[model samples]
Target: SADDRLNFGDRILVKAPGYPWWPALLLRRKETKDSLNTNSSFNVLYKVLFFPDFNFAWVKRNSVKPLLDSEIAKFLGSSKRKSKELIEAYEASKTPPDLKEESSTDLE
Candidate 1:
């Protein structure tokens, strides 16, 4: 789902109507139900923190986009991997895969 693509602490670029694109920090998200519409769609809302003045606002999916490589690279490098799962995954990726042993018949 599109909602699952973003997470807390993730950086995103948000574009407000008639305003230039800006970076924001994802604070939290809420899963909402659209009862007024028959489409039965799920609405995901995110609370974002903007820098400089550190303003907070709720933003919809269309307003947000993935962080750029340079933007994300600095974030990831500064914090180190914060999530336990992320750290484990990073460590796992660093390790080489193990090879299976040959059958005993070949040895005989």
Candidate 2:
């Protein structure tokens, strides 16, 4: 379901239970079913990193919304690396997974 969709490493604002909504990094997604609630339409979980203190939590899909462009800039500004280096680091990390996959086939 599109309602369950959130891309890995995407930025979002999450409303944690008992806490005001805050800026966060979308770390990953999990497929989780509600055992007690049989009528729940979907079951998706997101791992989030709330900024300033950087507390992490697993939250339901309903807890998040698309981040505004201005918020995205401010959120990324909290990182240690400058924008260019951050971009470089992100690009560099992308290569390893497929390379490892390709390398493994040579073993077989």
Candidate 3:
């Protein structure tokens, strides 16, 4: 029964970014004519949690590989060296072809 319940007060902690970090949360999506008066196209706001604590944790799941490789190639002069590295990396990453048939669980 302990696993079936949870509780919170009038607030909850939300994840946000940066030093002296700001907190964040999902909030209701809405629009206003006042924003359109200032030429605002679209905007969505969310709840926020402000913490002055010095300790925090974060997750870095961003796929920076594409960007990094782009930078690398650009710097390397788009030359034979870059081409060789790209081919080598691609060749090393490949595996044998998957020739096996599917759904062999029992053919009735």
Give per-model TM-scores. Answer: 0.50, 0.50, 0.19
Candidate 2 wrongly placed segments (more than 4 Å) = 1-5, 34-42, 72-108
In model 3, which runs have C-alpha deviations exceeding 4 angstroms? 1-9, 18-34, 37-41, 52-108
| Residue pairs clashing, model 2 | none
lDDT of 3 at 94: 26
**Candidate 1 wrong stretches, greater than 4 Å:** 1-5, 34-41, 72-108
lDDT accuracy of residue 5 in candidate 1? 53
Ten-residue stretch with the least lDDT total in model 2: 96-105
lDDT per prediction?
0.56, 0.58, 0.28
lDDT of 3 by residue, 4-61 (tens): 2112111122334532212211122233445447674544333221223223332221
Q: lDDT by residue for model 1 over 1-108, one digit each (tens)?
A: 654656666666677557655556566787678676747787777887665334766779688886644654454355753555433322322221211121244553
Clashes of 3: 0
- Taking the tens digit of each residue's C-alpha lDDT, what string does model 2 give over 1-108? 665545666556688677556656677687676677768766678886654443677878678887645555554455664455344323333333322232222544
Q: Top lDDT: which candidate number? A: 2
